[PDB]
Each structure stands twice: as C-alpha cells, then as structure tokens.
Amino acid sequence: GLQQCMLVSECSRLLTADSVPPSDSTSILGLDKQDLLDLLPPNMLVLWVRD
C-alpha cells in the first residue's frame, strides 16, 4: 500500500509539470492525474496505511 501510494504520487508529479494550465499541454502517454489516482488502493486501505 505504502509503495503504491508513493509511486502514484511520484508519477503524478512527473505528469503535472506544475507548468501553467496551458489548457493545451500534451501529457505523457496522454495520461492525466486522474488516470493515476485510479490505480491507488481502495480509500480504506490508503487511510489505514497513512495511520
């Protein structure tokens, strides 16, 4: 759970070049932050891991 949370976070950041919304910037592999958040373990497991 912890490894997966860290990995998702690391990869989310790879995608979010904090750059300026350009409404037009082509993401790597066409992936958005939301596509990665879906690969997170179930919310009950994430809270358990953080506690």
């Binding site: 949370c5 860290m6 998702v8 976070s9 690391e10 989310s12 950041r13 953080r50 506690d51």
Partner: protein
C-alpha cells in the same frame, strides 16, 4: 610608481567614500604596504561577490526542492506525516540540526559517518 600610486589613491577613495582621505606619510614602504593591501582587498572582494551570488542561487534552488518534496510527501503520505508526536518531532529536529552542524549533503549514514 606613478601607476601604483594612482591605484592606491583610487582604492582609498573607494574605501573611505565621502570622507576626506586622511593625510599620511607617502614613502616607498607605506606605498608598498598599501599597494599589497589594495591588491588583496580587490581580489577578496571579487571572490566574496561570486560566493554571495552563488549562495543566493543555491537558496532559491533549495527552496524549490523543499517545496517539491513537501508536495510529494503530502500527496503520497497525507498531511498526517506532519502530525508527529512531541518526541517524534524532537528526534526529527535533532537529526536535522546534527546534519546542519556537520554541513552534510543529506541525512544518510554514508554522509554522517565520514563527517
């Protein structure tokens, strides 16, 4: 002698700013000493300027990385990683303060031990 003298007078004017240059005995020895001092000061001022500008740049870079790591940890571990117990915070501060005291690149044992 005339060139060294000019350099000294210019240097003294720079150092004393708007204050009238104090009268001093101008002999071969006093001029040599002042000249060595002027050369030394000029060379050090240059070095210190370069170091000061670099530290400003490094301060910006460290700040940027700190923000990055904070964001990474918040997104990955949640806000709860910042809610450590009093003792936990004390332990964290001691590691941090020890590393700063030894001017380490990071908190790894590979850095702490040799230091």
């Amino acid at each position: 002698m005339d060139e060294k003298s000019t350099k000294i007078i210019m240097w003294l004017k720079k150092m004393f700013g708007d204050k009238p240059l104090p009268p001093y005995e101008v002999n071969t020895r006093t001029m040599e000493i002042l000249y060595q001092l002027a050369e030394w000061n000029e060379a050090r001022d240059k070095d210190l300027s370069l170091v000061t500008e670099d530290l400003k740049l490094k301060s910006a870079e460290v700040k940027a990385e700190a923000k990055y790591l904070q964001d990474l940890l918040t997104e990955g571990l949640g806000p709860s990683y910042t809610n450590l117990s009093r003792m936990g915070n004390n332990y964290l501060n001691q590691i941090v303060d020890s590393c700063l005291a030894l001017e380490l690149k990071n908190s790894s044992l590979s850095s702490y031990i040799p230091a």
